[PDB]
């Protein structure tokens, strides 16, 4: 079976990943194994999204990239006049992956391109490297494979970024929405008294302080909890913990200013 095992690996890991938010270290991990190679997947402008080493590199320029999360500008912008996948580059490539500063270090330095296309579009890189082991027509259907499915990967993270806030903004609007104008400006208030994402408050005292009514801080709470915005928790003879749920919650409420 062979080359199906290691396909249907790959297949395992995409479907474990499902539901979880994107992680692309365990997805070049997986890669390194089915492969046996050098795994880094470059976006378009160098942030190594996550890589997976498979034989150590004693060079302490490559050891910073790698911390820094990095490859260099010149390097990644090159990368994209590789089309198609090219597959075989000696250490004499500009394209190889490894150091050349020590050309002779690894003569046998065998670095594998491969562009990871999107929905219609080049959203990265997926580069494999090793020393002397060719990159042989079964192992270059792994790195095809692989590379359309990190390339999933890289369209759902931002799918559900994207989405996410499209939820969030939407309680806000919930929230805004159902306040009365006096409620609301008792927000801008409680707010106000408050610098942080959460905090406790007794009603009774700001009504008195800032001149509002105990009731409509009280019902103006009890719309943003409704909302999602936030959480309350009785504190009995002493005020009412809060804890907004939403960021954008509190920037909203700058923007209209009057
Ligand atoms: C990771 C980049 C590699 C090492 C490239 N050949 C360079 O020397 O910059």
């Known amino acids: 079976m062979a080359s199906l095992q290691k396909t249907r690996i790959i297949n395992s890991m995409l479907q474990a990943a499902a539901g979880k938010p994107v992680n692309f270290k365990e997805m070049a991990e997986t890669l390194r194994d089915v492969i046996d190679s050098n795994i880094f997947v470059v976006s378009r402008r160098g942030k190594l999204l996550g890589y997976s080493i498979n034989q ?11 911390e820094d999360r990095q490859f260099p500008e010149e390097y990644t912008k090159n990368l994209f006049n590789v089309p198609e996948t090219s597959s075989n580059l000696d250490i004499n490539s500009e394209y190889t992956a490894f150091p050349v500063e020590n050309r002779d270090l690894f003569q046998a330095g065998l670095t594998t391109i491969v562009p990871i296309i999107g929905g219609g579009e080049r959203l990265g890189t997926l580069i494999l490297s090793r020393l002397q082991d060719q990159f042989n027509d079964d192992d270059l259907i ?35 929405s159902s306040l009365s104008y006096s409620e609301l400006e008792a927000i ?41 915005v936030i959480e309350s928790r009785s ?11 939403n960021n954008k919650f509190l920037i909203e409420l700058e923007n209209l200013k009057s």
């Open 188 to 228: 801008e208030h409680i707010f106000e008294e408050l610098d942080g994402n959460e905090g406790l408050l007794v009603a009774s005292k700001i009504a008195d302080r800032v001149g509002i009514t105990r009731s409509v801080i009280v019902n103006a709470l009890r719309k943003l909890e409704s909302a999602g």
């Open 235 to 245: 504190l009995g003879m002493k005020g009412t913990y809060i804890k907004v749920l």
């Open 142 to 176: 792994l790195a095809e494979y692989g590379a359309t499915v990190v390339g999933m990967e890289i369209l759902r993270e931002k799918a559900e970024e994207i989405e996410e806030e499209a939820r969030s903004k939407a309680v806000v609007q919930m929230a805004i």
């Open 56 to 66: 150590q590199i004693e060079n302490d320029r490559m050891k910073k990239m790698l």
